[PDB]
Amino acid sequence: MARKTPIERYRNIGICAKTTTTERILFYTGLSHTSAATTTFWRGMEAQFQDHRVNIIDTPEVERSLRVLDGAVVVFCGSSGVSETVWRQADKYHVPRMVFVNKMDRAGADFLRVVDQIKNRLGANPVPIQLNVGAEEDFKGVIDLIKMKMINWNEADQGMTFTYEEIPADMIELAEEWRNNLVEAAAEASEELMDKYLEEGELTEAEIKQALRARTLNNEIVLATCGSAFKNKGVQAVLDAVIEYLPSPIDVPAIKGIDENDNEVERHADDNEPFSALAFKIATDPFVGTLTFIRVYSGVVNTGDAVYNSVKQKKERFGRIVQMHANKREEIKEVRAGDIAAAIGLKDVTTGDTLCNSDHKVILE
């Protein structure tokens, strides 16, 4: 029995802030194709990618949530802005992140101000990849600084389609100043990119995206976007950024746990590694009893498998397994490395417990 979706197309993310951003993500993903974790599909605003499985993990415990997700979308209101406690813990666990400055349609909205605060108050290195076109009631879209094009989302579709257009005349200089910043941000990813940047004064879109992705993954920068969920202008582009810049399960370090001799060991994101998983939320249900949400880090688990609860030091047997989608449940038979699902009816599993292969015991938490 083989893997159906390559592990590189998974994005385990948290949306940290939230309810409006998440509801819009479920809406866009749904028509294009609180629950502890919801699986959605996204192939890009222009269907420019293969289908990616985006597992959206509900975020507030906090230290546990950050190990369950691989990357995060940290959402800041355009008017208030800067979270500080969460950001610091994220730094400790080296969680790659991007930033979404939402509510750009509201009074007092100022994208660059929020960005300057992330740099100054949070000690981060934010790099905008967009510029808002207007603010408050004048907010009508964004500028994709990499393509150097304005995104005009259709109003009747609810932003389900858009058209690329030219950067309006009064924004050209501002758009160029910030594109220069992002390019130099990309140039510092390698010796080769810097040498080209210095000689030619430019980099290709593919070079810029690869570089910005690498710097996001090594926690050197945080890319910044903006928009408005209510005006259906922006979250569609956040979803593209998740694919382009946030990590897959093989882009983060192997999870660490403790073995039977109290020594630190790791479990690599590979289906051939011994099975290991963390139970991160247990939800009750009036028809199926309990839903034990697990993040699988390594190996595979199937319905009928005997596994070991390393905390309780007892065997559990997996029965039914489900993944929650926005509008239904998919009943499944296996859960592989890098994925999230819920096991129905486990007997004695508590939140934070590790489930693993009996012959390679490990406690993740």
Side-chain angles (χ1 to χ4, degrees), residues 104 131-136 138-143 150-152 167-168 170-171 226:
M104 289 304 297
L131 287 175
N132 54 308
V133 170
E136 312 192 2
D138 293 297
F139 173 82
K140 190 273 150 57
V142 302
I143 288 170
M150 185 170 63
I151 305 176
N152 275 18
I167 296 176
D170 57 14
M171 278 174 284
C226 71

mmCIF file with all atom_site columns, all heavy atoms in Angstrom, residues 104 131-136 138-143 150-152 167-168 170-171 226:
data_model
loop_
_atom_site.group_PDB
_atom_site.id
_atom_site.type_symbol
_atom_site.label_atom_id
_atom_site.label_alt_id
_atom_site.label_comp_id
_atom_site.label_asym_id
_atom_site.label_entity_id
_atom_site.label_seq_id
_atom_site.pdbx_PDB_ins_code
_atom_site.Cartn_x
_atom_site.Cartn_y
_atom_site.Cartn_z
_atom_site.occupancy
_atom_site.B_iso_or_equiv
_atom_site.pdbx_formal_charge
_atom_site.auth_seq_id
_atom_site.auth_comp_id
_atom_site.auth_asym_id
_atom_site.auth_atom_id
_atom_site.pdbx_PDB_model_num
ATOM 1   N N   . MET A 1 104 ? -7.407  45.558 6.195   1.00 0.00 ? 104 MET A N   1
ATOM 2   C CA  . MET A 1 104 ? -6.896  46.786 5.525   1.00 0.00 ? 104 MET A CA  1
ATOM 3   C C   . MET A 1 104 ? -7.965  47.783 5.098   1.00 0.00 ? 104 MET A C   1
ATOM 4   O O   . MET A 1 104 ? -7.652  48.925 4.750   1.00 0.00 ? 104 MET A O   1
ATOM 5   C CB  . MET A 1 104 ? -6.012  46.473 4.328   1.00 0.00 ? 104 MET A CB  1
ATOM 6   C CG  . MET A 1 104 ? -4.651  45.886 4.670   1.00 0.00 ? 104 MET A CG  1
ATOM 7   S SD  . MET A 1 104 ? -3.775  46.989 5.804   1.00 0.00 ? 104 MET A SD  1
ATOM 8   C CE  . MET A 1 104 ? -3.566  48.481 4.833   1.00 0.00 ? 104 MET A CE  1
ATOM 9   N N   . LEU A 1 131 ? 2.197   45.251 -1.419  1.00 0.00 ? 131 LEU A N   1
ATOM 10  C CA  . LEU A 1 131 ? 1.879   46.614 -0.964  1.00 0.00 ? 131 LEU A CA  1
ATOM 11  C C   . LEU A 1 131 ? 0.389   46.695 -1.187  1.00 0.00 ? 131 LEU A C   1
ATOM 12  O O   . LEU A 1 131 ? -0.136  46.192 -2.187  1.00 0.00 ? 131 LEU A O   1
ATOM 13  C CB  . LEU A 1 131 ? 2.525   47.769 -1.752  1.00 0.00 ? 131 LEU A CB  1
ATOM 14  C CG  . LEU A 1 131 ? 4.016   48.005 -1.559  1.00 0.00 ? 131 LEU A CG  1
ATOM 15  C CD1 . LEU A 1 131 ? 4.499   49.095 -2.514  1.00 0.00 ? 131 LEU A CD1 1
ATOM 16  C CD2 . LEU A 1 131 ? 4.309   48.363 -0.118  1.00 0.00 ? 131 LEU A CD2 1
ATOM 17  N N   . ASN A 1 132 ? -0.301  47.275 -0.214  1.00 0.00 ? 132 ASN A N   1
ATOM 18  C CA  . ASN A 1 132 ? -1.727  47.505 -0.349  1.00 0.00 ? 132 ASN A CA  1
ATOM 19  C C   . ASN A 1 132 ? -1.950  48.630 -1.360  1.00 0.00 ? 132 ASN A C   1
ATOM 20  O O   . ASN A 1 132 ? -1.124  49.576 -1.488  1.00 0.00 ? 132 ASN A O   1
ATOM 21  C CB  . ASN A 1 132 ? -2.312  47.970 0.987   1.00 0.00 ? 132 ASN A CB  1
ATOM 22  C CG  . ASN A 1 132 ? -1.576  49.158 1.538   1.00 0.00 ? 132 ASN A CG  1
ATOM 23  O OD1 . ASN A 1 132 ? -0.340  49.142 1.654   1.00 0.00 ? 132 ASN A OD1 1
ATOM 24  N ND2 . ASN A 1 132 ? -2.315  50.175 1.935   1.00 0.00 ? 132 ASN A ND2 1
ATOM 25  N N   . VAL A 1 133 ? -3.061  48.532 -2.081  1.00 0.00 ? 133 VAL A N   1
ATOM 26  C CA  . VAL A 1 133 ? -3.460  49.562 -3.004  1.00 0.00 ? 133 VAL A CA  1
ATOM 27  C C   . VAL A 1 133 ? -4.608  50.243 -2.260  1.00 0.00 ? 133 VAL A C   1
ATOM 28  O O   . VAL A 1 133 ? -5.762  49.763 -2.287  1.00 0.00 ? 133 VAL A O   1
ATOM 29  C CB  . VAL A 1 133 ? -3.924  48.993 -4.347  1.00 0.00 ? 133 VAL A CB  1
ATOM 30  C CG1 . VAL A 1 133 ? -4.569  50.078 -5.187  1.00 0.00 ? 133 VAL A CG1 1
ATOM 31  C CG2 . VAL A 1 133 ? -2.744  48.370 -5.095  1.00 0.00 ? 133 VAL A CG2 1
ATOM 32  N N   . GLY A 1 134 ? -4.270  51.343 -1.572  1.00 0.00 ? 134 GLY A N   1
ATOM 33  C CA  . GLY A 1 134 ? -5.217  52.085 -0.789  1.00 0.00 ? 134 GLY A CA  1
ATOM 34  C C   . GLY A 1 134 ? -5.290  51.519 0.607   1.00 0.00 ? 134 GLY A C   1
ATOM 35  O O   . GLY A 1 134 ? -4.624  50.527 0.955   1.00 0.00 ? 134 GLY A O   1
ATOM 36  N N   . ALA A 1 135 ? -6.127  52.165 1.398   1.00 0.00 ? 135 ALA A N   1
ATOM 37  C CA  . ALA A 1 135 ? -6.346  51.805 2.800   1.00 0.00 ? 135 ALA A CA  1
ATOM 38  C C   . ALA A 1 135 ? -7.702  52.343 3.209   1.00 0.00 ? 135 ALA A C   1
ATOM 39  O O   . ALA A 1 135 ? -8.160  53.343 2.662   1.00 0.00 ? 135 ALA A O   1
ATOM 40  C CB  . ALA A 1 135 ? -5.241  52.377 3.676   1.00 0.00 ? 135 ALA A CB  1
ATOM 41  N N   . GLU A 1 136 ? -8.303  51.694 4.208   1.00 0.00 ? 136 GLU A N   1
ATOM 42  C CA  . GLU A 1 136 ? -9.649  52.011 4.698   1.00 0.00 ? 136 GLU A CA  1
ATOM 43  C C   . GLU A 1 136 ? -10.646 51.765 3.544   1.00 0.00 ? 136 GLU A C   1
ATOM 44  O O   . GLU A 1 136 ? -10.483 50.779 2.794   1.00 0.00 ? 136 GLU A O   1
ATOM 45  C CB  . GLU A 1 136 ? -9.736  53.425 5.270   1.00 0.00 ? 136 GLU A CB  1
ATOM 46  C CG  . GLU A 1 136 ? -8.597  53.743 6.235   1.00 0.00 ? 136 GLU A CG  1
ATOM 47  C CD  . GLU A 1 136 ? -8.826  55.015 7.013   1.00 0.00 ? 136 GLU A CD  1
ATOM 48  O OE1 . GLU A 1 136 ? -9.892  55.638 6.828   1.00 0.00 ? 136 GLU A OE1 1
ATOM 49  O OE2 . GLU A 1 136 ? -7.955  55.373 7.830   1.00 0.00 ? 136 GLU A OE2 1
ATOM 50  N N   . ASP A 1 138 ? -10.649 53.022 0.843   1.00 0.00 ? 138 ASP A N   1
ATOM 51  C CA  . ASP A 1 138 ? -9.927  53.141 -0.465  1.00 0.00 ? 138 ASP A CA  1
ATOM 52  C C   . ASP A 1 138 ? -9.147  51.884 -0.848  1.00 0.00 ? 138 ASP A C   1
ATOM 53  O O   . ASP A 1 138 ? -8.572  51.794 -1.968  1.00 0.00 ? 138 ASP A O   1
ATOM 54  C CB  . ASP A 1 138 ? -9.035  54.396 -0.499  1.00 0.00 ? 138 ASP A CB  1
ATOM 55  C CG  . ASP A 1 138 ? -9.849  55.676 -0.485  1.00 0.00 ? 138 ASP A CG  1
ATOM 56  O OD1 . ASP A 1 138 ? -10.615 55.903 -1.443  1.00 0.00 ? 138 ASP A OD1 1
ATOM 57  O OD2 . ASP A 1 138 ? -9.726  56.464 0.475   1.00 0.00 ? 138 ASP A OD2 1
ATOM 58  N N   . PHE A 1 139 ? -9.139  50.906 0.055   1.00 0.00 ? 139 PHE A N   1
ATOM 59  C CA  . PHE A 1 139 ? -8.485  49.631 -0.192  1.00 0.00 ? 139 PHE A CA  1
ATOM 60  C C   . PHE A 1 139 ? -9.217  48.887 -1.306  1.00 0.00 ? 139 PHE A C   1
ATOM 61  O O   . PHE A 1 139 ? -10.362 48.489 -1.122  1.00 0.00 ? 139 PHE A O   1
ATOM 62  C CB  . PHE A 1 139 ? -8.476  48.768 1.087   1.00 0.00 ? 139 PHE A CB  1
ATOM 63  C CG  . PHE A 1 139 ? -7.975  47.397 0.851   1.00 0.00 ? 139 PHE A CG  1
ATOM 64  C CD1 . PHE A 1 139 ? -6.615  47.145 0.811   1.00 0.00 ? 139 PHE A CD1 1
ATOM 65  C CD2 . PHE A 1 139 ? -8.865  46.360 0.622   1.00 0.00 ? 139 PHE A CD2 1
ATOM 66  C CE1 . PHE A 1 139 ? -6.133  45.875 0.535   1.00 0.00 ? 139 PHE A CE1 1
ATOM 67  C CE2 . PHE A 1 139 ? -8.394  45.079 0.353   1.00 0.00 ? 139 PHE A CE2 1
ATOM 68  C CZ  . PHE A 1 139 ? -7.027  44.835 0.322   1.00 0.00 ? 139 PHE A CZ  1
ATOM 69  N N   . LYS A 1 140 ? -8.534  48.660 -2.444  1.00 0.00 ? 140 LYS A N   1
ATOM 70  C CA  . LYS A 1 140 ? -9.148  47.976 -3.584  1.00 0.00 ? 140 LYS A CA  1
ATOM 71  C C   . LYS A 1 140 ? -8.347  46.739 -4.087  1.00 0.00 ? 140 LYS A C   1
ATOM 72  O O   . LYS A 1 140 ? -8.793  46.045 -4.994  1.00 0.00 ? 140 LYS A O   1
ATOM 73  C CB  . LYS A 1 140 ? -9.400  48.993 -4.718  1.00 0.00 ? 140 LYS A CB  1
ATOM 74  C CG  . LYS A 1 140 ? -10.245 48.455 -5.869  1.00 0.00 ? 140 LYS A CG  1
ATOM 75  C CD  . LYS A 1 140 ? -9.468  47.737 -6.972  1.00 0.00 ? 140 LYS A CD  1
ATOM 76  C CE  . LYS A 1 140 ? -10.317 46.663 -7.636  1.00 0.00 ? 140 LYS A CE  1
ATOM 77  N NZ  . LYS A 1 140 ? -11.593 47.189 -8.196  1.00 0.00 ? 140 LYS A NZ  1
ATOM 78  N N   . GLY A 1 141 ? -7.206  46.437 -3.468  1.00 0.00 ? 141 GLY A N   1
ATOM 79  C CA  . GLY A 1 141 ? -6.404  45.298 -3.876  1.00 0.00 ? 141 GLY A CA  1
ATOM 80  C C   . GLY A 1 141 ? -4.986  45.376 -3.382  1.00 0.00 ? 141 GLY A C   1
ATOM 81  O O   . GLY A 1 141 ? -4.680  46.166 -2.488  1.00 0.00 ? 141 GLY A O   1
ATOM 82  N N   . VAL A 1 142 ? -4.108  44.556 -3.960  1.00 0.00 ? 142 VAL A N   1
ATOM 83  C CA  . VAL A 1 142 ? -2.697  44.570 -3.544  1.00 0.00 ? 142 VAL A CA  1
ATOM 84  C C   . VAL A 1 142 ? -1.816  44.555 -4.752  1.00 0.00 ? 142 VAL A C   1
ATOM 85  O O   . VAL A 1 142 ? -2.273  44.304 -5.859  1.00 0.00 ? 142 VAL A O   1
ATOM 86  C CB  . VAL A 1 142 ? -2.269  43.350 -2.665  1.00 0.00 ? 142 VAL A CB  1
ATOM 87  C CG1 . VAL A 1 142 ? -3.118  43.257 -1.408  1.00 0.00 ? 142 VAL A CG1 1
ATOM 88  C CG2 . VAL A 1 142 ? -2.335  42.020 -3.432  1.00 0.00 ? 142 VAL A CG2 1
ATOM 89  N N   . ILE A 1 143 ? -0.544  44.841 -4.514  1.00 0.00 ? 143 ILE A N   1
ATOM 90  C CA  . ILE A 1 143 ? 0.444   44.739 -5.550  1.00 0.00 ? 143 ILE A CA  1
ATOM 91  C C   . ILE A 1 143 ? 1.318   43.551 -5.188  1.00 0.00 ? 143 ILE A C   1
ATOM 92  O O   . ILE A 1 143 ? 1.826   43.460 -4.070  1.00 0.00 ? 143 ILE A O   1
ATOM 93  C CB  . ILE A 1 143 ? 1.289   46.006 -5.715  1.00 0.00 ? 143 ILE A CB  1
ATOM 94  C CG1 . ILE A 1 143 ? 0.417   47.102 -6.346  1.00 0.00 ? 143 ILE A CG1 1
ATOM 95  C CG2 . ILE A 1 143 ? 2.469   45.730 -6.642  1.00 0.00 ? 143 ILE A CG2 1
ATOM 96  C CD1 . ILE A 1 143 ? 1.044   48.468 -6.341  1.00 0.00 ? 143 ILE A CD1 1
ATOM 97  N N   . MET A 1 150 ? -0.629  44.462 -10.297 1.00 0.00 ? 150 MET A N   1
ATOM 98  C CA  . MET A 1 150 ? -1.697  44.694 -9.377  1.00 0.00 ? 150 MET A CA  1
ATOM 99  C C   . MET A 1 150 ? -2.705  43.580 -9.548  1.00 0.00 ? 150 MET A C   1
ATOM 100 O O   . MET A 1 150 ? -3.028  43.211 -10.663 1.00 0.00 ? 150 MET A O   1
ATOM 101 C CB  . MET A 1 150 ? -2.370  46.016 -9.655  1.00 0.00 ? 150 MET A CB  1
ATOM 102 C CG  . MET A 1 150 ? -3.422  46.331 -8.620  1.00 0.00 ? 150 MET A CG  1
ATOM 103 S SD  . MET A 1 150 ? -4.012  48.009 -8.792  1.00 0.00 ? 150 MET A SD  1
ATOM 104 C CE  . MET A 1 150 ? -4.803  48.105 -10.415 1.00 0.00 ? 150 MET A CE  1
ATOM 105 N N   . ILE A 1 151 ? -3.184  43.049 -8.433  1.00 0.00 ? 151 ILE A N   1
ATOM 106 C CA  . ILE A 1 151 ? -4.190  42.006 -8.429  1.00 0.00 ? 151 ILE A CA  1
ATOM 107 C C   . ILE A 1 151 ? -5.539  42.674 -8.198  1.00 0.00 ? 151 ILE A C   1
ATOM 108 O O   . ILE A 1 151 ? -5.767  43.322 -7.155  1.00 0.00 ? 151 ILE A O   1
ATOM 109 C CB  . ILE A 1 151 ? -3.989  40.964 -7.292  1.00 0.00 ? 151 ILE A CB  1
ATOM 110 C CG1 . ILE A 1 151 ? -2.602  40.365 -7.344  1.00 0.00 ? 151 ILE A CG1 1
ATOM 111 C CG2 . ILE A 1 151 ? -5.045  39.886 -7.384  1.00 0.00 ? 151 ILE A CG2 1
ATOM 112 C CD1 . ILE A 1 151 ? -2.305  39.422 -6.233  1.00 0.00 ? 151 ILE A CD1 1
ATOM 113 N N   . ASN A 1 152 ? -6.414  42.497 -9.184  1.00 0.00 ? 152 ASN A N   1
ATOM 114 C CA  . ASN A 1 152 ? -7.771  42.993 -9.190  1.00 0.00 ? 152 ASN A CA  1
ATOM 115 C C   . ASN A 1 152 ? -8.727  41.835 -9.070  1.00 0.00 ? 152 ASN A C   1
ATOM 116 O O   . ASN A 1 152 ? -9.077  41.229 -10.062 1.00 0.00 ? 152 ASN A O   1
ATOM 117 C CB  . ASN A 1 152 ? -8.074  43.748 -10.498 1.00 0.00 ? 152 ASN A CB  1
ATOM 118 C CG  . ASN A 1 152 ? -7.649  45.199 -10.456 1.00 0.00 ? 152 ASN A CG  1
ATOM 119 O OD1 . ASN A 1 152 ? -6.837  45.603 -9.619  1.00 0.00 ? 152 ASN A OD1 1
ATOM 120 N ND2 . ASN A 1 152 ? -8.232  46.008 -11.339 1.00 0.00 ? 152 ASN A ND2 1
ATOM 121 N N   . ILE A 1 167 ? 0.670   48.427 -12.314 1.00 0.00 ? 167 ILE A N   1
ATOM 122 C CA  . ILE A 1 167 ? 0.751   49.162 -11.050 1.00 0.00 ? 167 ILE A CA  1
ATOM 123 C C   . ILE A 1 167 ? 0.291   50.582 -11.373 1.00 0.00 ? 167 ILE A C   1
ATOM 124 O O   . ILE A 1 167 ? 0.783   51.164 -12.333 1.00 0.00 ? 167 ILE A O   1
ATOM 125 C CB  . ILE A 1 167 ? 2.200   49.155 -10.511 1.00 0.00 ? 167 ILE A CB  1
ATOM 126 C CG1 . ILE A 1 167 ? 2.635   47.720 -10.174 1.00 0.00 ? 167 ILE A CG1 1
ATOM 127 C CG2 . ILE A 1 167 ? 2.348   50.089 -9.315  1.00 0.00 ? 167 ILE A CG2 1
ATOM 128 C CD1 . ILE A 1 167 ? 4.085   47.596 -9.723  1.00 0.00 ? 167 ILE A CD1 1
ATOM 129 N N   . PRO A 1 168 ? -0.706  51.118 -10.640 1.00 0.00 ? 168 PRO A N   1
ATOM 130 C CA  . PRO A 1 168 ? -1.126  52.500 -10.931 1.00 0.00 ? 168 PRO A CA  1
ATOM 131 C C   . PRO A 1 168 ? 0.063   53.482 -10.855 1.00 0.00 ? 168 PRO A C   1
ATOM 132 O O   . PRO A 1 168 ? 1.035   53.213 -10.132 1.00 0.00 ? 168 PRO A O   1
ATOM 133 C CB  . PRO A 1 168 ? -2.182  52.774 -9.858  1.00 0.00 ? 168 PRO A CB  1
ATOM 134 C CG  . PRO A 1 168 ? -2.741  51.421 -9.541  1.00 0.00 ? 168 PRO A CG  1
ATOM 135 C CD  . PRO A 1 168 ? -1.565  50.485 -9.625  1.00 0.00 ? 168 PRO A CD  1
ATOM 136 N N   . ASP A 1 170 ? 0.690   56.434 -9.435  1.00 0.00 ? 170 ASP A N   1
ATOM 137 C CA  . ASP A 1 170 ? 1.133   57.021 -8.155  1.00 0.00 ? 170 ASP A CA  1
ATOM 138 C C   . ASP A 1 170 ? 1.762   56.026 -7.159  1.00 0.00 ? 170 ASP A C   1
ATOM 139 O O   . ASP A 1 170 ? 2.174   56.415 -6.052  1.00 0.00 ? 170 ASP A O   1
ATOM 140 C CB  . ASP A 1 170 ? -0.005  57.809 -7.503  1.00 0.00 ? 170 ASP A CB  1
ATOM 141 C CG  . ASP A 1 170 ? -1.246  56.978 -7.282  1.00 0.00 ? 170 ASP A CG  1
ATOM 142 O OD1 . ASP A 1 170 ? -1.168  55.731 -7.389  1.00 0.00 ? 170 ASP A OD1 1
ATOM 143 O OD2 . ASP A 1 170 ? -2.304  57.585 -7.007  1.00 0.00 ? 170 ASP A OD2 1
ATOM 144 N N   . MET A 1 171 ? 1.836   54.753 -7.537  1.00 0.00 ? 171 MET A N   1
ATOM 145 C CA  . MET A 1 171 ? 2.442   53.747 -6.662  1.00 0.00 ? 171 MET A CA  1
ATOM 146 C C   . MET A 1 171 ? 3.745   53.174 -7.205  1.00 0.00 ? 171 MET A C   1
ATOM 147 O O   . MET A 1 171 ? 4.489   52.567 -6.441  1.00 0.00 ? 171 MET A O   1
ATOM 148 C CB  . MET A 1 171 ? 1.454   52.638 -6.311  1.00 0.00 ? 171 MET A CB  1
ATOM 149 C CG  . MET A 1 171 ? 0.495   52.995 -5.173  1.00 0.00 ? 171 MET A CG  1
ATOM 150 S SD  . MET A 1 171 ? -0.743  51.706 -4.944  1.00 0.00 ? 171 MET A SD  1
ATOM 151 C CE  . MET A 1 171 ? -1.803  52.075 -6.339  1.00 0.00 ? 171 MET A CE  1
ATOM 152 N N   . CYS A 1 226 ? -0.884  41.365 2.836   1.00 0.00 ? 226 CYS A N   1
ATOM 153 C CA  . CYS A 1 226 ? -1.997  42.082 3.428   1.00 0.00 ? 226 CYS A CA  1
ATOM 154 C C   . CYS A 1 226 ? -3.298  41.946 2.645   1.00 0.00 ? 226 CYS A C   1
ATOM 155 O O   . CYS A 1 226 ? -3.380  41.346 1.553   1.00 0.00 ? 226 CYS A O   1
ATOM 156 C CB  . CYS A 1 226 ? -1.667  43.575 3.582   1.00 0.00 ? 226 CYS A CB  1
ATOM 157 S SG  . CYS A 1 226 ? -1.587  44.553 2.055   1.00 0.00 ? 226 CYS A SG  1
#
